[PDB]
Design a protein around this ligand. Structure first.
Ligand code: GTP
Ligand code: GTP
Ligand code: GDP
Ligand code: GDP
Ligand code: MG
Ligand code: MG
Lengths: 430, 430, 51, 109, 430, 431
């Protein structure tokens, strides 16, 4: 029976896990202690005494972020064994998190994940959260995926990650981590959800009228993305869709596993008073480039696969009228080899609403997972920034001093150049 | 005597089969508990066709519910008629196919087939004289389209003489719920042509436009779609269960219906479909039943017969009516639309009469028809299959299962040869 | 036959209720023992300050 | 007052007061012996088992003490019946029917 | 008249007999005190098969309980029906065997064999015409598999013509609870072949399989296993104690079940095993008893008869039936599965009918069969005994008792020569 | 009736002796006077005054460890003839405890063994507790079984002892004691239970959150061990396990009587509050080498025989499922000549909880006894360290001056090399 285990890595992973597990707590009705005053069993592990424990492993290379959870509201909810800490961090260095500091605690996380899924009988997959910017989220995440694949050759590895924003950046040495990590998400990943923080900044300000957001506002918006993905597993629906169902209809070739997400409607309560919301209305905003969670225009590319995930008061009648209306639009492109590129999932339960949240209660919802080739331009900008670094060999002595050979820098650059080349081959129409 | 074992596969087949088992429960006056609350003696005379005897005046449906995912079984047992089926008859695995035909047919279907084979052998040997089997599934799935075909191939070897009807669900190209649907569809029709006595190709899109125009339901759910499907399967065996002026059964039709073994695909039809505003302005007569059914809009296939030639046509009528009027109405339509009937077969229409009307209604009729226009959909699948296959797209999922490549070629070759010989019967000089 | 089926269903319901009540009692009992521990670990530190 | 006792366990396990006589060591002193941690504290209700069952050996002790069963009867010889009727018992070493019959004539036996 | 003396060996046996003497006392209406609270005169007509008369309308078991560890009988007498037993019939040693076949067979068994021989002599001379003895033990112990074999050899010399039945417990390879198990098993069957009229191969793992699947018990204890085993023993002698349309006894089955003296092993089955949910939907008939029995899942042996040939088959029926439906069934099952029945023996089946049903039930059946599948178990032990014995492992314990090394070889040879001719009886031409 | 007698030896033996017995008084529920306000007869015995008198003898060559028992809480519980002391000790000298000081009071203890052996009718085995390091725990200990063997030839003589830790050491002259006593644990021992304090230190800090443990915390878990083996004697079970039963199903060859223990679960009360415990969960923790109390990794070797002692509210059904899951694993290896290597025992009685303890009150548990060849590396480290002494003869003058011949040192070193070789022969796989 379905069970998903979260392997959140890094400061982003811990803060995301605080937001995501809060939503899961309110969806099933979990008290902050963890007692009800079996849809929970995919996420909350029921013990004998009525106590329910999240099936998550928070891991970070510094204690300060995890210790806030240790002294937070949900301190008694989480297993202290699950929350793994470390004395020293990678400090924006992939090499420190891959060859010196990771190996001290690569072993410990493996045994903790070992115990979590030993409790589980039928494991669906692994939901893994990290970042391409930080050293721990990029370095330490790379080894565990490498070690998870040899331990679990068949188990699924979904990859929700923070990609570097095209313009704003929290660090300078970020592209070195970003380039070197992309090998891991190619040969040790099944699907990928790179998200830049900049796109949500526009989306939250333009739509939710929050002129001064914070990471919680971003982490909440990441929250129901996973919830709408796992809604079919948790709750019954007209068209229940498992993770294997949408993995198949999104990946035409093993080298292409980088789709783009989209959520709708995303609108404040005082705003939502004025628009009647229908299936056609919410599905049209899912194709608008202004609502993309990646800074790229699919109008410059072509869609090759889309996963539809309706949720709430949706009717299969209005599903097909929306799909047909979408298909009669020249502004939307499609490849020649995919005449039918839709995978519709329908769920009964409407999305619950978190307190202190901008989103109003809405009776129906919609989720998009569109794989298109317009993502390839984002890596090209990274290639422009990475190559223009490597000519002067800036910050190289840091990575060399950790004990890793500088030739891997060229190899990682070479791989992504081939990866961009592969996306243009699909863009060719015969 | 003449019993039916109702096969059931996939989320599709489980939901329609749940609806189908509900309607005939109403016809035979069975409560959700399992006892008989009917009034007429004929309501309990031939109940052993679908029901099996249990102690204390109880009857169990003779169905074998199969699905690779346990979630649909929970939804089945939680319905109104959820506690009428024998829990031993529920056979299910822990992992689904994920819309992959190859996983359902080779990898995961090989474990569950033995358990289902033992259930049906238990059920088949129980009945005295089994007329034949009957299966419902979807071609756009992973279990019914997958393992469901593997079940057919095994038991045809086991039980060759018995009839095989399938209410298979053919995906529509205008609206699609799967991206890899041509692959599952193509690899299933090749299994259909070799081992199937008769097929009812029912299209969901052809169901949708009915509810828009014929019934004018604002919010047609899947229950309405299943209810219309349920009315069809009841209308085939209604003369079997109840005596009439001119009786029939499945073998009465299939012997009369297929001129050649390579042609066993029909477009089913149901006559009394009127909206609530239509009840005010109507007169229940035999000509109105004939006029409404011969309209192509009433059809639950995705193919206009006016582009093809009607090889053979059935009209199974339910009720007490004039036999002269049904004799004359078919004779009139055979002469008026002469070009739409082939000339090498005179009197292309076969009729049977069942005295008992459907519950809550006075007059009804059913239509089973083989026409040349059904090749319009198979070639449209080849239009989509070859477009995706020529680039080897979505192939590693299937290739990883261990199957070879020539299976795609031979399955496409069989359907190309099928539509080739299907075409030649259209332009044939008598 | 109806004597037999009534007896069987009655036994099934009885054992279901017995299992439910045992599980209900078990959870509450552990909670109270914990309540002893928090005070027990509170005296030992309060003892320690006094030394 | 707390958890449902097993109702077979003796009242010593129902009342923790009956183990008085220890705990009589004084902390809060420099002359505190480490071994005094052994048996340091009198128990409470919470540290006392819900269920106690024994392995009562008085079911074997007296048989073991008074010896194992033996028999030294000389012979209970009980040649039995091969026919179920209470009137007759014809033996394998006997070739003669019992219960002499009632015949009208020819009584030559 | 026709009396049975029940011999009792080992911790395995002592709990089997205690559960057995409970159910038969229920069948004969005997209170915990020992008096007769029954209602039908048939409940007290043939009680002296197992009980002896005591002053005051009291009845005492004719059983002799033997174990090397005194701790077991205290648990035996402290049961519900513990006080019914007579203390003199309890025989025990002061020191156990430690699952060692040697100390029970040679060293300490020599001290205890004199005392048990006296009481079984006393119980023998008490009754009129003893039909034979009956011993229950386990092949994985030290006393039942050890000393328990010594009593059989002694009583065969003393009482050769009397029937000797043994419901042994053979260890399972998949789940084993004793490291020295293959040594004891190899050294016990050689004693079993030479001196035994009839043996039943009972395995706990198969018993474990049934309650998992057939009864769906969440927490089945060893008592449920004793419930199933005692159900087998009662169904064997239900024709002896109670009248029926077609009577039988142990000797009627014994003459018919061993075609040759070297093959006296039979795997027993019990028919009416349904979960409490399965009681809701069923129709109690003779074919359903035939159906449920002739499933290999119902078997409580660790051998699948589908891989072997049935030599002889016996099915003893408990209840009041019309045998035309009974007699038609074994004729069919002989004909359809003709590949699994030998051809040199026509009409392989013998059946018996006892009028009195079991208490609290209407109809049931017990089955005794000889198949070729039993060599699957002996050669499986040969796979394990040879592995242990080739390296002389665990030998010094048996060597310290004073036995030679040739005994293992000859016992290995005897079981190998047993299966060798057993293979030839499988591959024999008619 | 089945009985067991404790012959606790040395400062260890006294300290674990009372710690094992403070748990013994509580399970049967005896007030420290010795009264109930028959499961107890395996250790206790009725007197004329109708109290439950110890069948336990305490011997030490230094009195200061003894009088704290004669002045502690349970002074009146014990009879003071049992508590045997001496005026002078061995002072980490095997020779003094075996040859000079031991022979003074060797007869006196032996009579007290005999009188306790007189009292019991059917004895099962002797429970011997000592330490490999101290002179009294080595010298006097080594002397006593050799004549205890020739007095009671057939009687089981079980062996609990402290094996010196690989890195941390309370002694420098410990390996001379450790090497020389190994002769007695091979020709005068039935089954050994060697344990080092360092691995106990690692387990409690990692699992029980006690950052500053002592001997008391170590003594309670060791007391939890001995209770588990003899629990099947005290209270009934579905499958009772006496001492002879697991003795047979652990020893492949007479020279191989060195198994390894494991107790699970061993967790703090705070962490146990939110972890469900089942049979599979606790049996998997037994196979983790991070929870073994001997500094060796069984993955580096192969199990010859595993013995199982479950305890708590355990069901035989989940036992077989746990065994099946364990068996279907490749890094968990087994020797080729042991296809079935398990000996399972089940008890309904849950483990009791002592005041001031560390282990949480848990409804179920498991004890594990594997005999593996991965322990062969343990005496190898001892052999390298001992050979790093004897080549240049450190501290030899002390042992020679006691009156014992230096040639025994080489022979004692040689036998352990031979014993290591025998463990290597078992590690060989069949052709
Ligand atoms: N969207 C979002 N991004 C976050 C959040 N927290 C951290 N990040 C991203 O993480 C990047 C920095 O890495 P961190 O996650 O802070 O640290 P790390 O992954 O553990 O790696 P180290 O800093 O080397 O320890 C920043 O550029 C952020 O974009 C968050 O709560 N929400
Ligand atoms: N685990 C444990 N080990 C102990 C304990 N007491 C002593 N030891 C060990 O015993 C070794 C020394 O022997 P001791 O028992 O202290 O003293 P002894 O055996 O009587 O020998 P002498 O010191 O010469 O009198 C040390 O290395 C300790 O590791 C204890 O309470 N628990
Ligand atoms: N008409 C109709 N179609 C259904 C229903 N339920 C599912 N389907 C169709 O079945 C397809 C999915 O089938 P799937 O669950 O993958 O089949 P499976 O893999 O064999 O279990 C979708 O395209 C739906 O359109 C229903 O109740 N009515
Ligand atoms: N089926 C079943 N097996 C049992 C039962 N009790 C014990 N056993 C088995 O009996 C074996 C132990 O036998 P043992 O006591 O050594 O026999 P003994 O040496 O003759 O006393 C174990 O392998 C158990 O699996 C029971 O109640 N039912
Ligand atoms: Mg960081
Ligand atoms: Mg000392």
């Amino acid at each position: 029976m379905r069970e998903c285990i979260s392997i959140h890595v890094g400061q982003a992973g811990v803060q995301i896990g605080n937001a995501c597990w809060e939503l899961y707590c309110l969806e099933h009705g979990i008290q902050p202690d963890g007692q009800m005053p079996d849809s929970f069993n995919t996420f909350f592990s029921e013990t004998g005494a009525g106590k329910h424990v999240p099936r998550a492993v928070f891991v970070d290379l510094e204690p300060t972020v995890v210790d806030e959870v240790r002294t937070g509201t949900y301190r008694q909810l989480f297993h202290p064994e699950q929350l793994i800490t470390g004395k020293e961090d990678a400090a924006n260095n992939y090499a420190r998190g891959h060859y010196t500091i990771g190996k001290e605690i690569v072993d410990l996380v493996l045994d903790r994940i070992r115990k979590l899924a030993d409790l589980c009988t039928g494991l669906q997959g692994f939901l893994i959260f990290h970042s391409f910017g930080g050293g721990t989220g990029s370095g330490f995440a790379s080894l565990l995926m490498e070690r998870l694949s040899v331990d679990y050759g068949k188990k699924s590895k979904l990859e929700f990650a923070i990609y570097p924003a095209p313009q704003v950046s929290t660090a300078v040495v970020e592209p070195y981590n970003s380039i070197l990590t992309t090998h891991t998400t190619l040969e040790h990943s099944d699907c990928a959800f790179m998200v830049d923080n900049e796109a949500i900044y526009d989306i939250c300000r333009r739509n939710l009228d929050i002129e001064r957001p914070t990471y919680t506002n971003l982490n909440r918006l990441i929250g129901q993305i996973v919830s709408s993905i796992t809604a079919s597993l948790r709750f019954d629906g007209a068209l229940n869709v498992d993770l294997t169902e949408f993995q198949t209809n999104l990946v035409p070739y093993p080298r292409i596993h980088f789709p783009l997400a989209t959520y709708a409607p995303v609108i404040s309560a005082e705003k939502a008073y004025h628009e009647q919301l229908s299936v056609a209305e919410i599905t049209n905003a899912c194709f608008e480039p202004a609502n993309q969670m990646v800074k790229c225009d699919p109008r410059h590319g072509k869609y090759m696969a889309c996963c539809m995930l309706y949720r709430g008061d949706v009717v299969p009648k209005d599903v097909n009228a929306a799909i047909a209306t979408i298909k009669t639009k020249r502004t939307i492109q499609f490849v020649d080899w995919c005449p039918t590129g839709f995978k519709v999932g329908i769920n009964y339960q409407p999305p619950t609403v978190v307190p202190g949240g901008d989103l109003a209660k809405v009776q129906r919802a919609v989720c998009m997972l569109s794989n298109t080739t317009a993502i390839a331009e984002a890596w090209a900008r990274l290639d422009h920034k990475f190559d223009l670094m490597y000519a002067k060999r800036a910050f190289v002595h840091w990575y060399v001093g950790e004990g890793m050979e500088e030739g891997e820098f060229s190899e990682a650059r070479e791989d992504l150049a081939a990866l961009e080349k592969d996306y243009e081959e699909v863009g060719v129409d015969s | 005597m003449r019993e039916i074992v109702h096969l059931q596969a996939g989320q599709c087949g489980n939901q329609i089969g749940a609806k189908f088992w509900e309607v005939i429960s109403d016809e035979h006056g069975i409560d959700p508990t399992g006892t008989y609350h009917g009034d007429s003696d004929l309501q309990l005379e031939r109940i052993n066709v679908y029901y099996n005897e249990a102690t204390g005046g109880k009857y169990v449906p003779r169905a074998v519910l199969v699905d690779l995912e346990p979630g649909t079984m929970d939804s089945v047992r939680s319905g109104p008629f959820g506690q009428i089926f024998r829990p031993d008859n529920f056979v299910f695995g822990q992992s689904g196919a994920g819309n992959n035909w190859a996983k359902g047919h080779y990898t995961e279907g090989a474990e569950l087939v033995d358990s289902v084979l033992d259930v049906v052998r238990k059920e088949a040997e129980s009945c005295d004289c089994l007329q034949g089997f009957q299966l419902t599934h979807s071609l756009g799935g992973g279990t019914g389209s997958g393992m469901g075909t593997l079940l057919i191939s095994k038991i045809r070897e086991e039980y060759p003489d018995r009839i095989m009807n399938t209410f298979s669900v053919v995906p529509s190209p205008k609206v699609s719920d799967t991206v890899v649907e041509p692959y599952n569809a193509t690899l299933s029709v090749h299994q259909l042509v070799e081992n199937t006595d008769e097929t009812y190709c029912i299209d969901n899109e052809a169901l949708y436009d009915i509810c828009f125009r014929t019934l004018k339901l604002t919010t047609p759910t899947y229950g309405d779609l299943n209810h219309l499907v349920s009315a069809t399967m009841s209308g085939v065996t209604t003369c079997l269960r109840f005596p009439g002026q001119l009786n029939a059964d499945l073998r009465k039709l299939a012997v009369n219906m297929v001129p050649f073994p390579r042609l066993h695909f029909f477009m089913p039809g149901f006559a009394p479909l009127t909206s609530r505003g239509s009840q005010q302005y109507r007169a229940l007569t035999v000509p109105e039943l004939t006029q409404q059914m011969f309209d192509a809009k009433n059809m639950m296939a995705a193919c206009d017969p006016r582009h093809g030639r009607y090889l053979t046509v059935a009209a199974v009528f339910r009720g007490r009516m004039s036999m002269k009027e049904v004799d004359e109405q078919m004779l009139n339509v055979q002469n008026k639309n002469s070009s739409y009937f082939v000339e090498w077969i005179p009197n292309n229409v076969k009729t049977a009469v069942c005295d008992i009307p459907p519950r809550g209604l006075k007059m009804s009729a059913t239509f089973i028809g083989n026409s040349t226009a059904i090749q319009e959909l198979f070639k449209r699948i080849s239009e989509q299959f070859t477009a995706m296959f020529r680039r080897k797209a979505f192939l590693h999922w299937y290739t990883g299962e261990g199957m070879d490549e020539m299976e795609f070629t031979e399955a496409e070759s069989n359907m190309n040869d099928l539509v080739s010989e299907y075409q030649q019967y259209q332009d044939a000089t008598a | 036959n109806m004597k037999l089926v009534g007896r069987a269903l009655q036994d099934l319901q009885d054992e279901a209720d017995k299992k439910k009540q045992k599980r209900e009692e078990m959870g509450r009992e552990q909670k109270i023992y914990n309540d002893y521990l928090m005070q027990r670990r509170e005296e030992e530190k309060a003892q320690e300050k006094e030394l | 007052d707390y958890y449902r006792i097993s109702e077979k366990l003796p009242v010593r396990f129902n009342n923790p007061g009956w183990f008085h006589g220890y705990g009589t060591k004084e902390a809060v002193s420099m002359y505190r012996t480490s071994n005094q941690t052994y048996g340091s504290r009198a128990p409470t209700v919470h540290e006392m088992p819900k269920v106690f069952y024994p392995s009562s050996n008085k079911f074997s002790r007296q048989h073991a003490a008074f010896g194992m069963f033996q028999s030294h009867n000389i012979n209970v010889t009980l040649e039995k019946s091969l026919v179920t009727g209470p009137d007759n018992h014809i033996t394998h070493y006997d070739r003669l029917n019992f219960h002499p019959s009632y015949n009208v004539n020819r009584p030559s036996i």
